């Protein structure tokens, strides 16, 4: 009976895989052969931040494209101002250990979590002397790897128990669970419309989840090793994915294919973070090799290189205005780049 | 207006004041990762320092420690172990008696030693349940040569100091298991990290300072590793 289900599953997979050829009538390389490349890009440092004691793991821009927060493993969650290099708040945590951080679109709240399995939400505009924990999102069995705000109330979280979850902060209970992943889910990116999000896990596969329904709309795969980072193309019809196999892969949602693999023979270390530019031409991926390579997302050629940090670059971000890129790293220095 | 820019500069004074005092306490404290099997007795050692993560703090000779027991997550430990690379020293506890799961513990130690991110951090090994191994050998039902054929033709090393009223038969076995741990420690030989094996039991009213003395050696050795004094 177990063999019956295994055999029955194979023809369902076989017909799905066979259909993907029919879709693959050409490659992106032939259609993008004509276009001239971006060529040489010269990104310089602007505003090397200081203040953090231990390695920076995560960061996030705000909607204003001015304030950014980042969490480090020392247990400080401090919000800078990029232009003035100044610390507006320095929020202590209970858990030195924090793998994620997100800044609310309203900017009233801010998210973080790690080994406590709590996406702790903090009020920035507390009338009192110091900021206070609004609501502890307890219930995940495993470490929180990424949590990101949908709205002031709705927040999506990925844990180390292979489950994504939407939470409601007012109610204080997990509303929607996302089951399907085999391995630990590492990253999220919300869609521009905030109706869908993609999430990569330690199984070399990404899954497109519907927020309202709570079911996997579509399953993406083709990566060789544990996936680490994931980000939508700003259109929201496609996304790139960094993995330990030291390549980035663009996946179209509509086409259900893997168009391009961003690999250079020399690079043999995993990708930790990925982000797109506002144009969606400069795919800048942060590597474990203590540098950040700016890939041309169209031509699959390294336009430039941002060899800033001493230790591994953990987190990336691009501003909503698309002025600059920030790169938290294990040397405890957020360098803002432009 | 530019007047408000002075306001944030005054706020930064309090922010900087708090961070600078927070740096003092941060650098003073020693982070330690407590790793081990379910049956290893991680929880037993935490009872000895009378002075879902479980953090414990103990003062020994007025230096603050923080030892992190991680027993909440799933068995998959390839992406949450990365976060303990800044840690001073991984207190790796192992059950000597559980011979079947001893090889699996050895394989776990090999992965920790040869990990990219944990390459720089030394592992304070606690060979726990030494007393329980003592009565197990006298039973003589379970035999190491069944699981480890090299034990059959293995004599005790010269650098052995058995406790009073210990059989030589158990002493060879006792120092074989550590030798198997220390086999991995020497294979890479880049001098970046160093296993500190110790033989411990439940009745041991110690190890508060055994970790202190070993962590003292790494802090001393890490200074000398800079000068090229070794």
């Amino acid at each position: 009976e177990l063999d019956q289900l295994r055999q029955e599953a194979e023809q369902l997979k076989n017909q799905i895989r066979d259909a993907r050829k029919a879709c693959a009538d050409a490659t992106l390389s032939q259609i993008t052969n004509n276009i001239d490349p971006v060529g040489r890009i010269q990104m310089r440092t602007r505003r090397t931040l200081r203040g953090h004691l231990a390695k920076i793991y995560a960061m996030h821009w705000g909607t204003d494209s001015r304030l950014l927060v980042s969490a480090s493993q020392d247990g400080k969650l401090i919000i800078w101002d990029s232009y003035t290099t100044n610390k507006v708040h320095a929020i202590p945590l209970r858990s030195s250990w924090v793998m994620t951080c997100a800044y609310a679109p309203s900017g009233n709240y801010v998210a973080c979590g790690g080994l406590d399995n709590i996406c702790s939400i903090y009020n920035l505009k507390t009338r009192e002397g110091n900021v206070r924990v609004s609501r502890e999102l307890a219930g995940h069995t495993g470490y929180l790897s990424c949590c990101r705000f949908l709205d002031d109330n709705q927040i999506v979280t990925s844990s180390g128990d292979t489950t994504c979850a939407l939470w409601d902060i007012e109610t204080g209970q997990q509303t929607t669970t996302f089951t399907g992943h085999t391995g630990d889910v590492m990253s999220l990116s919300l869609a521009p419309d905030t109706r869908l999000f993609v999430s990569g896990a330690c199984d070399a596969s990404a899954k497109l989840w519907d927020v309202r329904e709570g079911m996997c709309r579509q399953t993406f795969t083709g990566h060789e090793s544990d996936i680490n980072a994931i980000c939508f193309f700003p259109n929201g019809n496609a996304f790139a994915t960094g993995s330990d196999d030291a390549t980035c892969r663009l996946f179209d949602l509509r086409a259900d294919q893997e168009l391009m693999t961003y690999s250079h023979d020399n690079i043999i270390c995993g990708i930790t973070s990925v982000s797109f530019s506002k144009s969606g031409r400069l795919l800048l991926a942060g590597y474990d090799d203590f540098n950040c390579n700016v890939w041309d997302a169209l031509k699959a050629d390294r336009a430039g290189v941002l060899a800033g940090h001493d230790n591994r670059v953990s987190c990336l971000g691009v501003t909503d205005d698309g002025m600059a890129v920030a790169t938290g790293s294990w040397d405890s220095f957020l360098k803002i780049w432009n | 207006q530019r007047n408000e820019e002075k306001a944030q500069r005054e706020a930064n004074k309090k922010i900087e004041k708090q961070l600078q005092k927070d740096k003092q306490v941060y650098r003073a404290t020693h982070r330690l990762l407590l790793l081990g099997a379910d049956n290893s007795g991680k929880s037993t050692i935490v009872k000895q320092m009378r002075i879902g993560i479980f953090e414990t703090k103990f003062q020994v000779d007025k230096v603050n420690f923080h030892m992190f027991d991680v027993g909440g997550q799933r068995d998959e430990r390839r992406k949450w172990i990365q976060c303990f690379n800044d840690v001073t020293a991984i207190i790796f506890v192992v059950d000597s008696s559980d011979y079947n799961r001893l090889q699996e513990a050895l394989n776990l130690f090999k992965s920790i030693w040869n990990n990219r991110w944990l390459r720089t951090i030394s592992v304070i090994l606690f060979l726990n349940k030494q007393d329980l191994l003592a009565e197990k050998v006298l039973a003589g039902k379970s035999k190491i040569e069944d699981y480890f054929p090299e034990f059959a033709r293995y004599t005790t090393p010269e650098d052995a100091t058995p406790e009073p009223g210990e059989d030589p038969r158990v002493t060879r076995a006792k120092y074989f298991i550590r030798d198997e741990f220390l086999r991995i420690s020497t294979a890479s030989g880049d001098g970046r990290h160093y296993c500190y094996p110790h033989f411990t039991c439940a009745v041991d009213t110690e190890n508060a300072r055994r970790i202190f003395n070993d962590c003292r050696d790494i802090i001393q050795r890490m200074h000398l590793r800079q000068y090229e004094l070794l």
Partner: nanobody
Amino acid sequence: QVQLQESGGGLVQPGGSLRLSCAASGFTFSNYKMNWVRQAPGKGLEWVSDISQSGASISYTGSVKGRFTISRDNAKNTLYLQMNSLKPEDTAVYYCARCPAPFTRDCFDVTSTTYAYRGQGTQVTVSS
């Protein structure tokens, strides 16, 4: 798509032989370290053996040391295991496993319950 589909294995008298295979597909075989893992009846996953990317640092659990022999053909993209002497304690399902990271000397979680890069497994059994 990463997939390890085994072949061979089955019923055999004690002291017999069995050539297991682990035809790997949807990734480059050549760059990854592989491993064998067996699951005994009413026991956790257990480690069998290893291969260090070229066949250089191969190791065994000690219980099966000096009996089994691993090889790989990078051209054919296949993993092998040899059986010569088989005890009752050796009746178990044998999963072929791959190391998570591509250019590493550490393998984590390969004996985990729900490891991603493990095959369907072959039930190797010894009985009258």
